[PDB]
Amino acid sequence: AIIYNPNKKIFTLHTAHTTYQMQVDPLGYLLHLYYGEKTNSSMDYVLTYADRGFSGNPYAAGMDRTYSLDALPQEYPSLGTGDYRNIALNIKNEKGVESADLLFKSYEIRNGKYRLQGLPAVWADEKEAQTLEIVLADENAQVEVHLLYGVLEENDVITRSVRIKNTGTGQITIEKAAAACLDFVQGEFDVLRFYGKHAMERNLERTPLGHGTIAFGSRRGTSSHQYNPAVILAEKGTTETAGSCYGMLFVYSGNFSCEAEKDQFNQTRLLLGLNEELFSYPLASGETFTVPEVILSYSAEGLSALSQQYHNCIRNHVCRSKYVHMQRPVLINSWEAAYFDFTGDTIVDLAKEAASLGIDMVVMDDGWFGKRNDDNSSLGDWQVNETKLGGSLAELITRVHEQGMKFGIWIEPEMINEDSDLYRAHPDWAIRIQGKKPVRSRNQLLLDFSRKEVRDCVFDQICVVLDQGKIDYVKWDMNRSMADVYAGNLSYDYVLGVYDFMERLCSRYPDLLLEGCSGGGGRFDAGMLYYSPQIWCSDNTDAINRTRIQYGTSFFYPVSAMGAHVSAVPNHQTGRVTSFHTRGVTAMAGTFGYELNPALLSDEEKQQIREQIKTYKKYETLINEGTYWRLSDPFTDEIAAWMSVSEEQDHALVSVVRLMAEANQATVYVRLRGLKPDAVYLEEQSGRQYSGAALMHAGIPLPPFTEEYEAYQFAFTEL
Amino acid sequence: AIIYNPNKKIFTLHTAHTTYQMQVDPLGYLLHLYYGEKTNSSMDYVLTYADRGFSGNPYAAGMDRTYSLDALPQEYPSLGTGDYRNIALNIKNEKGVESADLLFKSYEIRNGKYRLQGLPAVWADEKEAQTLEIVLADENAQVEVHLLYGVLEENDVITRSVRIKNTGTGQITIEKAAAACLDFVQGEFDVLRFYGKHAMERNLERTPLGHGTIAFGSRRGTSSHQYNPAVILAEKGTTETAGSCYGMLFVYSGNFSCEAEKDQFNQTRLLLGLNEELFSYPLASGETFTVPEVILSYSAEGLSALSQQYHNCIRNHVCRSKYVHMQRPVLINSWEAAYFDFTGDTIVDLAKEAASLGIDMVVMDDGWFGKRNDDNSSLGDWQVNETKLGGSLAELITRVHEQGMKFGIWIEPEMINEDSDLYRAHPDWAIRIQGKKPVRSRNQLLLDFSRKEVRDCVFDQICVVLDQGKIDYVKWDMNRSMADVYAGNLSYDYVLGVYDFMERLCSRYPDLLLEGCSGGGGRFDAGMLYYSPQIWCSDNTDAINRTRIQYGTSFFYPVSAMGAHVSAVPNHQTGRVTSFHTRGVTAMAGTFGYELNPALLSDEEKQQIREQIKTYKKYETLINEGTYWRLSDPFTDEIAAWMSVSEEQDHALVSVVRLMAEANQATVYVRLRGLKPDAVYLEEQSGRQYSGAALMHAGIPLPPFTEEYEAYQFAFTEL
Ligand SMILES: OC[C@H]1O[C@H](O)[C@H](O)[C@@H](O)[C@H]1O
Ligand SMILES: OC[C@H]1O[C@H](O)[C@H](O)[C@@H](O)[C@H]1O
Ligand code: NA
Ligand code: NA
Ligand code: NA
Ligand code: NA
Ligand code: NA
Ligand code: NA
Ligand code: NA
Ligand code: NA
Ligand code: NA
Ligand code: NA
Ligand code: NA
Ligand code: NA
Ligand code: NA
Ligand code: NA
Ligand code: NA
Ligand code: NA
Ligand code: NA
Ligand code: NA
Ligand code: NA
Ligand code: NA
Ligand code: NA
Ligand code: NA
Ligand code: NA
Ligand code: NA
Ligand code: NA
Ligand code: NA
Ligand code: NA
Ligand code: NA
Ligand code: NA
Ligand code: NA
Ligand code: NA
Ligand code: NA
Ligand code: NA
Ligand code: NA
Ligand code: NA
Ligand code: NA
Ligand code: NA
Ligand code: NA
Ligand code: NA
Ligand code: NA
Ligand code: NA
Ligand code: NA
Ligand code: NA
Ligand code: NA
Ligand code: NA
Ligand code: NA
Ligand code: NA
Ligand code: NA
Ligand code: NA
Ligand code: NA
Ligand code: NA
Ligand code: NA
Ligand code: NA
Ligand code: NA
């Protein structure tokens, strides 16, 4: 629900269990009053006013020294109001002045959920959602700012976006534009962020917010491996199952900044949106710019509920693929199996092997195009290497279909190698600075996807390939960060180009299962999930490390989105050995699939594949649609444990991987969550029965281990 | 409810929201299965068995090395089973052997709540409570042990006691006897205990339980100022409003020991009961010994709920006084007002002063008897000093009644000074060791209250005094710890003597308001609360320190039990100055009352007394009967804040004392608890209205302070 009280100038947003409230003050500033547990109260009483030294006053406050935007909580604070905190908006006007001082002009409440020009965004119908659009303006900056709030009641989600219009005659530049700001007048908080590196993404870092700013971001042209565009502000003491916590998730696959600051008056400001760095976005007279969306949510009941709200929102209101609600073929991918050393016959052999085991699809990964026999050539030359494939792609696809298997293929359309026909013809299509030799990364360069002619060339090549036969699946990868950034519009316009190509591709090929990739999880974000219902979670396929990566990814993203494959050992990234069974349990917390040559496996491991596939298919709906619960913290605990529970709470699958081993082992219990306390549950394999209450308070004892890194799955059914 | 499953040999105790379960194993040992959230399951599945090095086996386990009482969880573990952990029971038999190895014999389930011979205990009716009595025995020790479990469903309380019988022909000695043991097979915990000193009792200490034991106790002959006989075992992460926590409270005013231990297998054992030190209790053939009671409770919802369960249990099932459910006269006490320097005329002047202000009662404190003109003589000489009083006690009482005032008096019956007629007549009545000069403390000695003839002498003297007139109130004090302990029965038998005298006194004078005292809160325990509905909480009457003492005392004990008086400044214990208003707010979190000479006060402060009394009387029922909530931690926070809420949640009184002051003050909010989220509440003085949800999530901003240590009261009424 969205309500306006014209007398108090208060806007109230209600979801099923939360309330967000704002107010236009007597000077026209849009103040933030409240976000938290549902309330019908007017929360304007929380605002207080004192003469605070060096916190100065709008001219319009006259002699009232107690009124300062350096103290007051705001929906969209800006540089140019006298506020000295981190701010959401900076405009440099047609005369060179960095100032924006925004006052209320108008509003509208609409049924349904706004969409964003050229960008992914949460979607819903007119019954499920309402939109509030508030217009603010600065007559001196000659800017008009449209704040968009989307309210999805059942999901306990509030979205925010911004449109900025130049209302003057001269060009302005947008120098900083956040999507969302939460201003807290009170509270002690921790900041949870998800950091990492290539092949080890999304480690949880949780620290108290001390005085000053905790900040993180990306200027890589991508959402990045290093810091995901996501933040949780947890009240001190909040756990998985209790206490207040607030999320912000950026629906965007490019650059971002997140800032959390505890100020001089013990107030907290949280910002998420575009990066200020390499962002100086020109806006001509009468033109509008759109800031990408942030999804906000609140839980009074701990982190697990917060995550569940995000999982539901992403599956049902971000991902557009039919595969959200359909079985997804179990695939085998050629990359760790063969790298570049394959032929068409190799690929068909992989199909034959995989068909005998119950695998549904073979994905031919990198190495099929140009003269791509290593990673030093041929990006941009999306012509099939028929010498290597021993014939045409059409014929290969048919040979694979004759084995009863679907076919998938890898592409990397944003990129170019110097050693390519495309680069010899069009070296100026690479992103570069004139006269400067560019950074190389994996011995490749980015194509300038801000340019239509560049995108069209590559799009046409990709269409020729995909039109050769029935291709069920595409893995779209992106293997380096952006450098040599030549202008202040490029980071943003590049990503608009990517999304345009991706929308064109999905529209032309609407039955395709698109898996996003960027050296693993380098663009693991809700912007990508709007197009691809799964993303390759990491190039690290070590089961033990995957427990941490998958744990971290689960704070915002649903299991169904996490690409996860059983790979060979010793693992190719870590050198560690794990049992086949543990690799299976871990990879079932995601898309499942295989990425190895099964011909090298023992008969016993081949039979394990058969049984794994039967297990995954049996529990696929539960894993993908069920309510997810983290049952341990793999950074600190003896085990990595998680579970999925059906909507009706009548079925659950519990997964456990042991992380530590010593002699004379203590008994380890796994405590379950999300069950009905008074219901009785049957554990399948053992045939023992337990109450929900028992399973949640005492849990179940794990069988004693006899080897390292053992794993378990337990299935419970309500009697 | 109490259930026995004869086939599984499981006993289940259910309260409204909790379940406690135990089992007799195939060897006859009484194992502890579970205590926590309510469940109908059989929790025997949590038991596990492994061959654990150096954890040995009952002979009766045969060749099964996996069965060890050094590992298994037990209701009442003992020295002599092969268990090497801290234990509950040690018996030294008629041959000198320290061993007890207890096996199940029989049980009974009875309606109602057991009572204890010569001791205070929780009481209830046959509809409110059930009792389980389990009999165990060791044929070699020739001991029979009766475990008593009391179940008070609505209160979520389980009580435990023990009776130990010598079934052999020779004398045995009881060397250790706990009342309660909780064995956890799993969990990470913190231990909360309440430590202090004279004039600064019951500071909260909360630490993680590391490997080894956290222990505390008293061998002072008293429950003590230094460590209260109370413990909370909180699961890691538990707060005031969420998470599992377990309490044990000893209903006993003598010596005790508490031990919490995390063992070699990461299990936790919690024990509470009698101290092993100075305890070697002889039991002749056929005789029975009774261990004092422990009150256990569990909360799944944090520490505040746990405390509320104790408050309810103590007010409605421990305190026997009519004054639990009646107005208690507002008193003025002569001690800080006059110390020993008073006459009968002084006392009447104090009555006249106090009557003009709305005070109901004058208490003549120490100094009225013998030649007690300082604290160096006359304990034991309970004859009225008619020279000092200018006439008889009867006449004084009448003169006070003529001023419209009730009369109270102080006694200290357990004690004797060398300079007394009693000591010159009966020096052997003091506790002492023959041939050894005794410890002196406040220049006095303890009387041997284990001896009937000693108790009878003093009891008769006290009766003569109390029979002189209408005495509405007695303060029974006790001003030193026990030393020179001459035998292993003395600590326990002394306390039996105290309780016998106290029961005799309360039975003879059933309309008396008895306030317990021991240099303040030196015996602030539920054993005393069975007799006295209030106890002088501390000799520290500094308002700021009282915020900490009262906070700590509230973890187990109700506000109504805490003696608290407005005293003069500079404070006599700390030298600190506080405003009269802050002293009033702080002292209203308890019995209220005054302890100063009002003749020295300004007219403005006298008017404050008038208004304070009106305020206290207006809110007396709410403060004494309402649900109590700690709203801050005075060890860490800016404020000491608390509130009381009516049963129907339609009325609340919120109290705040500021603890810290700086310039350019930040706005401090007090967040309320225990209200109905959707109800609308009117704040009285301001006339503003708020939802419960608003008051609990955002709270209310405190008015800015202009002086140090300011205090506030806010009253809320449901509209
Ligand atoms: O070069 C191919 C290789 O590229 C990236 O590393 C991907 O994340 C891998 O899965 C694989 O597709
Ligand atoms: O000597 C009298 C004195 O004794 C103890 O200190 C009490 O706690 C005081 O309140 C007072 O009664
Ligand atoms: Na302000
Ligand atoms: Na300013
Ligand atoms: Na200024
Ligand atoms: Na500030
Ligand atoms: Na603010
Ligand atoms: Na604003
Ligand atoms: Na601002
Ligand atoms: Na910028
Ligand atoms: Na805000
Ligand atoms: Na990776
Ligand atoms: Na990351
Ligand atoms: Na900081
Ligand atoms: Na960066
Ligand atoms: Na980054
Ligand atoms: Na990331
Ligand atoms: Na600061
Ligand atoms: Na804050
Ligand atoms: Na930001
Ligand atoms: Na990158
Ligand atoms: Na963009
Ligand atoms: Na991606
Ligand atoms: Na990615
Ligand atoms: Na990412
Ligand atoms: Na995202
Ligand atoms: Na699994
Ligand atoms: Na995996
Ligand atoms: Na987990
Ligand atoms: Na055991
Ligand atoms: Na043993
Ligand atoms: Na042994
Ligand atoms: Na042990
Ligand atoms: Na145990
Ligand atoms: Na036992
Ligand atoms: Na034992
Ligand atoms: Na002993
Ligand atoms: Na126990
Ligand atoms: Na004291
Ligand atoms: Na204490
Ligand atoms: Na310890
Ligand atoms: Na002691
Ligand atoms: Na002590
Ligand atoms: Na104490
Ligand atoms: Na240990
Ligand atoms: Na434990
Ligand atoms: Na003990
Ligand atoms: Na003592
Ligand atoms: Na006793
Ligand atoms: Na007492
Ligand atoms: Na006491
Ligand atoms: Na005590
Ligand atoms: Na007690
Ligand atoms: Na008060
Ligand atoms: Na007080
Ligand atoms: Na408090």
Side-chain angles (χ1 to χ4, degrees), chain A residues 511-525:
Chain A
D511 293 297
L512 263 188
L513 178 51
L514 187 63
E515 178 163 341
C517 191
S518 181
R523 294 199 296 207
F524 203 110
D525 63 70

PDB file of all heavy atoms in Angstrom, chain A residues 511-525:
ATOM      1  N   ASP A 511      13.484 -19.574 -26.107  1.00  0.00           N
ATOM      2  CA  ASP A 511      13.504 -20.868 -25.420  1.00  0.00           C
ATOM      3  C   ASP A 511      14.859 -21.298 -24.894  1.00  0.00           C
ATOM      4  O   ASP A 511      14.973 -22.355 -24.303  1.00  0.00           O
ATOM      5  CB  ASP A 511      12.836 -21.903 -26.291  1.00  0.00           C
ATOM      6  CG  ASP A 511      11.347 -21.594 -26.432  1.00  0.00           C
ATOM      7  OD1 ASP A 511      10.628 -21.616 -25.405  1.00  0.00           O
ATOM      8  OD2 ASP A 511      10.938 -21.206 -27.537  1.00  0.00           O
ATOM      9  N   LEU A 512      15.848 -20.435 -25.114  1.00  0.00           N
ATOM     10  CA  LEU A 512      17.236 -20.667 -24.669  1.00  0.00           C
ATOM     11  C   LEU A 512      17.322 -20.611 -23.180  1.00  0.00           C
ATOM     12  O   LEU A 512      16.729 -19.715 -22.575  1.00  0.00           O
ATOM     13  CB  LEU A 512      18.180 -19.565 -25.165  1.00  0.00           C
ATOM     14  CG  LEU A 512      19.010 -19.770 -26.411  1.00  0.00           C
ATOM     15  CD1 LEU A 512      20.014 -18.603 -26.569  1.00  0.00           C
ATOM     16  CD2 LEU A 512      19.717 -21.108 -26.389  1.00  0.00           C
ATOM     17  N   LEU A 513      18.064 -21.540 -22.596  1.00  0.00           N
ATOM     18  CA  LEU A 513      18.546 -21.412 -21.193  1.00  0.00           C
ATOM     19  C   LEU A 513      19.874 -20.657 -21.303  1.00  0.00           C
ATOM     20  O   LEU A 513      20.839 -21.220 -21.842  1.00  0.00           O
ATOM     21  CB  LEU A 513      18.751 -22.780 -20.537  1.00  0.00           C
ATOM     22  CG  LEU A 513      19.290 -22.885 -19.085  1.00  0.00           C
ATOM     23  CD1 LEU A 513      18.473 -21.996 -18.125  1.00  0.00           C
ATOM     24  CD2 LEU A 513      19.329 -24.322 -18.570  1.00  0.00           C
ATOM     25  N   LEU A 514      19.916 -19.415 -20.814  1.00  0.00           N
ATOM     26  CA  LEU A 514      21.114 -18.585 -20.818  1.00  0.00           C
ATOM     27  C   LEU A 514      21.750 -18.684 -19.412  1.00  0.00           C
ATOM     28  O   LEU A 514      21.057 -18.514 -18.381  1.00  0.00           O
ATOM     29  CB  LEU A 514      20.780 -17.140 -21.164  1.00  0.00           C
ATOM     30  CG  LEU A 514      21.924 -16.174 -21.363  1.00  0.00           C
ATOM     31  CD1 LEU A 514      22.826 -16.534 -22.555  1.00  0.00           C
ATOM     32  CD2 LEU A 514      21.428 -14.707 -21.483  1.00  0.00           C
ATOM     33  N   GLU A 515      22.996 -19.124 -19.369  1.00  0.00           N
ATOM     34  CA  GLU A 515      23.779 -19.087 -18.128  1.00  0.00           C
ATOM     35  C   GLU A 515      24.775 -17.947 -18.250  1.00  0.00           C
ATOM     36  O   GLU A 515      25.606 -17.942 -19.160  1.00  0.00           O
ATOM     37  CB  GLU A 515      24.460 -20.424 -17.848  1.00  0.00           C
ATOM     38  CG  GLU A 515      25.318 -20.372 -16.573  1.00  0.00           C
ATOM     39  CD  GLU A 515      25.700 -21.729 -16.000  1.00  0.00           C
ATOM     40  OE1 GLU A 515      25.057 -22.764 -16.316  1.00  0.00           O
ATOM     41  OE2 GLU A 515      26.678 -21.785 -15.197  1.00  0.00           O
ATOM     42  N   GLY A 516      24.714 -16.994 -17.340  1.00  0.00           N
ATOM     43  CA  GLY A 516      25.697 -15.935 -17.292  1.00  0.00           C
ATOM     44  C   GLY A 516      27.010 -16.425 -16.688  1.00  0.00           C
ATOM     45  O   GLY A 516      27.049 -17.394 -15.924  1.00  0.00           O
ATOM     46  N   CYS A 517      28.091 -15.789 -17.088  1.00  0.00           N
ATOM     47  CA  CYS A 517      29.433 -16.128 -16.579  1.00  0.00           C
ATOM     48  C   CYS A 517      30.346 -14.954 -16.723  1.00  0.00           C
ATOM     49  O   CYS A 517      30.177 -14.148 -17.637  1.00  0.00           O
ATOM     50  CB  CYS A 517      29.979 -17.349 -17.353  1.00  0.00           C
ATOM     51  SG  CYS A 517      31.461 -18.120 -16.688  1.00  0.00           S
ATOM     52  N   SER A 518      31.324 -14.828 -15.834  1.00  0.00           N
ATOM     53  CA  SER A 518      32.381 -13.846 -15.994  1.00  0.00           C
ATOM     54  C   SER A 518      33.553 -14.365 -15.177  1.00  0.00           C
ATOM     55  O   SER A 518      33.701 -14.038 -13.983  1.00  0.00           O
ATOM     56  CB  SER A 518      31.922 -12.484 -15.482  1.00  0.00           C
ATOM     57  OG  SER A 518      32.913 -11.493 -15.634  1.00  0.00           O
ATOM     58  N   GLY A 519      34.347 -15.239 -15.769  1.00  0.00           N
ATOM     59  CA  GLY A 519      35.359 -15.959 -15.025  1.00  0.00           C
ATOM     60  C   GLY A 519      34.762 -16.506 -13.758  1.00  0.00           C
ATOM     61  O   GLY A 519      35.271 -16.236 -12.655  1.00  0.00           O
ATOM     62  N   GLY A 520      33.683 -17.271 -13.870  1.00  0.00           N
ATOM     63  CA  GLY A 520      32.899 -17.622 -12.708  1.00  0.00           C
ATOM     64  C   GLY A 520      31.910 -16.520 -12.360  1.00  0.00           C
ATOM     65  O   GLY A 520      31.198 -16.011 -13.238  1.00  0.00           O
ATOM     66  N   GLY A 521      31.898 -16.141 -11.104  1.00  0.00           N
ATOM     67  CA  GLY A 521      30.940 -15.211 -10.566  1.00  0.00           C
ATOM     68  C   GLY A 521      31.333 -13.758 -10.555  1.00  0.00           C
ATOM     69  O   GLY A 521      31.077 -13.056  -9.591  1.00  0.00           O
ATOM     70  N   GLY A 522      31.988 -13.282 -11.609  1.00  0.00           N
ATOM     71  CA  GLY A 522      32.431 -11.905 -11.703  1.00  0.00           C
ATOM     72  C   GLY A 522      31.346 -10.868 -12.043  1.00  0.00           C
ATOM     73  O   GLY A 522      31.606  -9.668 -11.977  1.00  0.00           O
ATOM     74  N   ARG A 523      30.173 -11.363 -12.442  1.00  0.00           N
ATOM     75  CA  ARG A 523      28.977 -10.544 -12.625  1.00  0.00           C
ATOM     76  C   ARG A 523      27.795 -11.325 -12.096  1.00  0.00           C
ATOM     77  O   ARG A 523      26.791 -11.601 -12.800  1.00  0.00           O
ATOM     78  CB  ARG A 523      28.741 -10.146 -14.087  1.00  0.00           C
ATOM     79  CG  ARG A 523      29.783  -9.239 -14.633  1.00  0.00           C
ATOM     80  CD  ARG A 523      29.348  -8.459 -15.910  1.00  0.00           C
ATOM     81  NE  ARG A 523      29.081  -9.340 -17.037  1.00  0.00           N
ATOM     82  CZ  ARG A 523      29.199  -8.978 -18.317  1.00  0.00           C
ATOM     83  NH1 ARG A 523      29.538  -7.754 -18.651  1.00  0.00           N
ATOM     84  NH2 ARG A 523      28.954  -9.875 -19.245  1.00  0.00           N
ATOM     85  N   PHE A 524      27.896 -11.715 -10.830  1.00  0.00           N
ATOM     86  CA  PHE A 524      26.851 -12.475 -10.160  1.00  0.00           C
ATOM     87  C   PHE A 524      25.941 -11.469  -9.500  1.00  0.00           C
ATOM     88  O   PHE A 524      26.128 -11.111  -8.337  1.00  0.00           O
ATOM     89  CB  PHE A 524      27.410 -13.496  -9.131  1.00  0.00           C
ATOM     90  CG  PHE A 524      26.460 -14.612  -8.873  1.00  0.00           C
ATOM     91  CD1 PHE A 524      26.721 -15.895  -9.319  1.00  0.00           C
ATOM     92  CD2 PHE A 524      25.264 -14.368  -8.235  1.00  0.00           C
ATOM     93  CE1 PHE A 524      25.807 -16.911  -9.124  1.00  0.00           C
ATOM     94  CE2 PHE A 524      24.338 -15.378  -8.057  1.00  0.00           C
ATOM     95  CZ  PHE A 524      24.604 -16.650  -8.517  1.00  0.00           C
ATOM     96  N   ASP A 525      24.967 -10.987 -10.254  1.00  0.00           N
ATOM     97  CA  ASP A 525      24.149  -9.882  -9.802  1.00  0.00           C
ATOM     98  C   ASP A 525      22.751 -10.023 -10.379  1.00  0.00           C
ATOM     99  O   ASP A 525      22.508 -10.738 -11.343  1.00  0.00           O
ATOM    100  CB  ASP A 525      24.804  -8.515 -10.117  1.00  0.00           C
ATOM    101  CG  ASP A 525      24.973  -8.281 -11.575  1.00  0.00           C
ATOM    102  OD1 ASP A 525      23.915  -8.076 -12.256  1.00  0.00           O
ATOM    103  OD2 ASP A 525      26.112  -8.272 -12.062  1.00  0.00           O
TER     104      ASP A 525
END
